[PDB]
Amino acid sequence: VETENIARGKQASQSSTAYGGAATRAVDGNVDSDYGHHSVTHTNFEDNAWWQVDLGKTENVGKVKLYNRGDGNVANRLSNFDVVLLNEAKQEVARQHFDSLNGKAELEVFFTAKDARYVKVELKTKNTPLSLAEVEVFRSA
Ligand SMILES: CC(=O)N[C@@H]1[C@@H](O[C@@H]2O[C@H](CO)[C@H](O)[C@H](O)[C@H]2O[C@@H]2O[C@@H](C)[C@@H](O)[C@@H](O)[C@@H]2O)[C@H](O[C@@H]2O[C@@H](C)[C@@H](O)[C@@H](O)[C@@H]2O)[C@@H](CO)O[C@@H]1O
Ligand SMILES: [Ca+2]
Ligand code: NI
DSSP, rough: OSSOOOOTTTTESSSSOTTTTTGGOOOOOOOOOOGGOOOOOOOOOOOTTTEEEEEEEEEEEEEEEEEEESTOGGGGGGSSSEEEEEOOTOEEEEEEEEEEOOOSSEEEEEEEEEEEEEEEEEETTTTTTOOOOEEEEEEEO
């Protein structure tokens, strides 16, 4: 993949916002995973929480990297989730399911040369907030 993080500074949004955990914290160029350092997102405790970045145009995506929240022993909240690519009309062009990050600070998701404008993370879990320290997106080589 290319090295430029194309998610950086892009428009981001999420299902809801709590504890001041603004969606733009996942694309601020800071992977610091300590919620107290203000670079980690947070939605409401809700069903099927989600977070999205608009790349602003259609790009050929090869890698999405998720960085989990690291403080407070709540890393497990990022489990049973999909990483979704959508085209400009917001139709799904790819989707990968993950049970867990297994303790790891991050997860690398590789997509097979998908032309997509939106990258979405979707929890499939009830009454669970979605918190991401950072989402980075890289073009196919
Ligand atoms: C229980 C409630 O959510 N607490 C909120 C505070 O967050 C908790 O603070 C604790 C120390 O005071 C400790 O750090 C806990 O780990 C932390 O709880 C975690 O994070 C929050 C944001 C939620 O996701 C909880 O479900 C989770 O268990 C919060 O404190 C502020 O953020 C934390 C991370 C830390 O930086 C702290 O020093 C900050 O004051 C406060 C203020 O918004 O609000 C709740 O009380
Ligand atoms: Ca961040
Ligand atoms: Ni600190």
